[PDB]
Every structure is written in C-alpha cells, then in structure tokens.
C-alpha cells in the first residue's frame, strides 16, 4: 500500500494542480486580462 | 406504451453521449453565441492569441 500512495500522489497533483494551471496562464490568462474594463487604467504606466 | 417501458434503464447510455457531445462545444459555441459582424474587441483578442 505505502507504494502505491507514494506513487500515486506526485502523480495526482502534477495532473490537477500544476498542468491545470500551466495550461491556464499559456491559454487563457491573456483573455481575462483583455477581458476586464478600463484598459486604459489597466495600463496607465508609472509616473517614473 | 410497450415501446416507451421498452428503452427505460438504457436511456442512461443516450443520456451520457449526449451530455459528453456537449462538454465539447460547449465550450467553444459561448464566443459563436453572442457572435456580431462589427466586434472590434473580439477582433483584437483573437488577434492577440
């Protein structure tokens, strides 16, 4: 059992926490960006 | 009747091939939906991607 759960675990997250978001900041990060109001006040640049 | 009792306990199997087509367009028909010939927003972000 202990190898199994070991096994197991990595596995899990690699596939439900980390290629999810992976996947989510090359696909679709840009569209929500672009998606939300105001972009002028979303890239107003620094007074600097 | 007889036919109607007939397919009962197998519409489950109809029933998940057609919600399994739907999870698949689903997806993509939300930009088709609200789809307009003069859209520059939607002209810029497909640009974008």
Same mark, same amino acid.
Do not use: Q, V, W
């Given at each position: 059992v202990n190898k199994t759960v070991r096994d197991l675990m990595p596995?899990?997250?690699m596939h439900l926490m980390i290629?999810?978001?992976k996947e989510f900041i090359f696909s679709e990060? $840009?569209?929500n960006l672009?998606?939300?109001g105001d972009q002028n006040? $979303?890239?107003e640049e620094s007074a600097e | 009747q007889q036919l109607?009792?007939?397919?009962?306990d197998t519409l489950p199997?109809?029933?998940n091939k057609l919600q399994s087509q739907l999870l698949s367009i689903e997806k993509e028909v939300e930009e088709y939906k609200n789809f307009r010939?003069?859209?520059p927003a939607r002209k810029t972000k497909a640009l974008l991607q």
């Open positions: 596995k899990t997250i290629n999810n978001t990060l $840009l569209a672009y998606s939300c006040t $979303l890239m | 109607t009792n007939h397919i009962r199997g109809l029933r010939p003069d859209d």
